[PDB]
Design a protein around this ligand. Structure first.
Ligand SMILES: NC(=O)c1ccc[n+]([C@@H]2O[C@H](COP(=O)([O-])OP(=O)(O)OC[C@H]3O[C@@H](n4cnc5c(N)ncnc54)[C@H](OP(=O)(O)O)[C@@H]3O)[C@@H](O)[C@H]2O)c1
Ligand SMILES: NC(=O)c1ccc[n+]([C@@H]2O[C@H](COP(=O)([O-])OP(=O)(O)OC[C@H]3O[C@@H](n4cnc5c(N)ncnc54)[C@H](OP(=O)(O)O)[C@@H]3O)[C@@H](O)[C@H]2O)c1
Ligand SMILES: [Ca+2]
Ligand SMILES: [Ca+2]
Lengths: 414, 411
């Protein structure tokens, strides 16, 4: 007898670049499509198609996520001066992640996948650390310019209702020039950031910490601390205490030290810049960047976008281009699919898709914990200089082993 | 007679660090070194009394005598302005001093062989050179109460046309906004201090910026570092088989976590403040750290104790109860300052004493004599017993004994 495939529903797919693009196709062909039939709204976010469409494909992909609520994104190249020369781009297009995050809005939650046999670089980290980055404002919408010489730099606020213009002196340059910057953030954006952070901490049963530098920026960072405390006392304190958890504000330099010596197991709300930086530090501390997942939680509580936290792994792609053997970890990209398929299952109440999404996550961890892993995870065990070829599998061997273990697990469940 | 010390500017601190500060002088320094001490009370009550005037006066004396040693002070918050009834929420005296003097704050962990590190690969130390000027620590921030236009404007001093850039058109409510700056001469000094530190240590140098987002602001740091490197330091770097490279701050924090150490990390003001606490904690203990501000003149130095004032131990001390306060950060502030003082004066005896006090401190902990916090780093706090550590006086008395023996066998 033949087995019918799972009806998956509508998912927005965004193809990427370089080695993650190769991994992306292997995941679809071997892990998803044999078992799930999807109404796939696919958008080619490769660097060449973004140039051909003048980055309009990035625009349409973001709007498609709005309409279908679920999106899975492959890692894409952010153009710099080297990529403009390499691909002969018309202009230096903006980062597709920044464009997508601008249209959707929300908080980017990043979390490392943990395997019991993969040692971390930070010894005490047992439970995962979930960092929630406020995906709006601060340095990423700032106006910076070069000060060419001596002169007065001021920042002013002119109320829209007419009068009461206020001028703040930044610096009076007296010897030479330099640089100056102005940046901002919005009350409504910080409020949505707070709600998603308190909701995430409650759904996991973990305490929440928000990091600012309000000792120095008493008004700018004070607004973040004030809004978080206001919403916590009014709408979340009793729920936190009922779950034996808590929320506390922390100075950023105190937060990174507390996290370094902690055991993990907490939600770490971060401002835009801090979330970008500390997430890569935390990801590397757990072992490998190929194990860090990411999901954008939009303020509507209904739209999400999952993707791997790492990039396109250009160094491995070059090896792949010259025919050399590679060992690229696909776990983060796999969990981008499972997190998106799980959310699609939740919205549609698709028990079959929900069971499948979790089974693929279990197969991935069970395979590594059974001793079958890529070179990056073997280096966590033995140290890179001591890794033998027999200690790991290449990019295609690991995908094959995952595909076989997934076929076995889904057959047993039936 | 005793060792001649010379002129040293001392800044007294608050609470427990102020107690240990006095203990360090009379037990470890004064019995062996005569000092021309120019004292400045940076206590929270004296700073409120003079409206923080004693802080700028202390910085000027550091400019005059070129050596400064600073105790940990209180940075007031809302609870502190109530406990002390302060006129205002005064800012950190370190930020005031760093702004007057400028330069680079070099931070490095104080390593002990028996104190376990938290990052498995950090077998070699990491030195962070934090730019001590501008950015968020000299900024102006304010609340945007509603819809309106926030603009930044540059008016040239020579009378040429001013430029106005739009920051944001607030149209859906209020929020916050801030302006911040840095100076070319200060960044050039930041570059020179970094290249010289790497050449002195024989380690590679990395600079972290976010020039993919702040193309002009952070791009100036990258461009200035690269021009000074290619024109004045590349040949010396290649002769010692070391290199300088710019790194994205995202990539660099990951590169440092999986590295083995042994490099200089030039950071902007904010990154150096945050990352140095991460690095110091990763090497074993957050308090086991040195912090020396190197001024661009090449002769002025201010060594500070970067950890807190240990308020809980101060309350225990005020109630007459025993405490176990770690004094190593305050001790190394003295030895680092005395070492630079000996270099300026060609004082071979003072230079030997400064290195001897550092070695005694490391040897004492490695021999098993240590405060309660370091014993918790080894055994774990719930497994630490009273016999596993020494109290505040006991550890300071053990250091003084071991120091006297070491200086005796030297002669
Ligand atoms: N979400 C996104 O779209 C996104 C995010 C960041 C960067 N990028 C883009 O990706 C491109 C590459 O940037 P990058 O190389 O700096 O970042 P990256 O691709 O994360 O860096 C790859 C490096 O990190 C390690 N690594 C990362 N992912 C891995 C995996 N899945 N398996 C095994 N090892 C892994 C490897 O170290 P070894 O060298 O030791 O093997 C590899 O060289 C850039 O064009 C960048 O713009 C995209
Ligand atoms: N360099 C500076 O000038 C500087 C820097 C930061 C903060 N501060 C100021 O210092 C004040 C203290 O703030 P805080 O509450 O963060 O105090 P703290 O000094 O960080 O004390 C926090 C806790 O950590 C442990 N600890 C810290 N230092 C220790 C030491 N030397 N030996 C043993 N244990 C130690 C103690 O734990 P147990 O009680 O468990 O023993 C202590 O209760 C603040 O007012 C702040 O403004 C100054
Ligand atoms: Ca990042
Ligand atoms: Ca700090």
């Amino acid at each position: 007898h033949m087995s019918k495939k799972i009806s998956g529903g509508s998912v927005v797919e965004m193809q990427g670049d370089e080695m993650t693009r190769i991994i992306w196709e292997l995941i679809k062909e071997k892990l998803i499509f044999p078992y799930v039939e999807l109404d796939l709204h696919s958008y080619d976010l490769g660097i060449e198609n973004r140039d051909a469409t003048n980055d309009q494909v990035t625009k349409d992909a973001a709007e498609a996520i709005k309409k279908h609520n679920v999106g899975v994104k492959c890692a894409t190249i952010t153009p710099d001066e080297k990529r403009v020369e390499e691909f002969k781009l018309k202009q230096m297009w903006k980062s597709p992640n920044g464009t997508i995050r601008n249209i959707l809005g929300g908080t980017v939650f990043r979390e490392a996948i943990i395997c019991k046999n993969i040692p971390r670089l930070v010894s005490g980290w047992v439970k995962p650390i979930i960092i929630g980055q406020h995906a709006y404002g601060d340095q990423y919408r700032a106006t910076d310019f070069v000060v060419p010489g001596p002169g007065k730099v001021e920042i002013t606020y002119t109320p829209s209702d007419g009068t009461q213009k206020v001028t703040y002196l930044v610096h009076n340059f007296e010897e030479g020039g330099g640089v100056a910057m102005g940046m901002y953030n919005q009350d409504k954006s910080i409020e949505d950031f707070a709600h998603s952070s308190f909701q995430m901490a409650l759904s996991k049963g973990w305490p929440l910490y928000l990091s600012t530098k309000n000792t120095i920026l008493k008004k700018y960072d004070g607004r973040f601390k004030d809004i978080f405390q206001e919403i916590y006392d009014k709408q979340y304190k009793s729920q936190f205490e009922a779950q034996k958890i808590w929320y506390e504000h922390r100075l950023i330099d105190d937060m990174v030290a507390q996290a370094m010596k902690s055991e993990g197991g907490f939600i770490w709300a971060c401002k835009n810049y801090d979330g970008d930086v500390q997430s890569d530090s935390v990801a590397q501390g757990y072992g490998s960047l190929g194990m860090m997942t990411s999901v954008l939680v939009c303020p509507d509580g209904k739209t999400v976008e999952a993707e791997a936290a790492h990039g396109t792994v250009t160094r491995h792609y070059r090896m792949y281009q010259k025919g050399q053997e590679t060992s690229t970890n696909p776990i983060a990209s796999i969990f981008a699919w499972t997190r998106g398929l799980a959310h699609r299952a939740k919205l549609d109440n698709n028990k079959e898709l929900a069971f499948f999404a979790n089974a693929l996550e279990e197969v991935s961890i069970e395979t590594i914990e059974a001793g079958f892993m890529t070179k990056d995870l073997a280096a966590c065990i033995k140290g890179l200089p001591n890794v033998q070829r027999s200690d790991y599998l290449n990019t295609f061997e690991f995908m094959d082993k995952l595909g076989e273990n997934l076929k076995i697990k889904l057959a047993q469940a039936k």
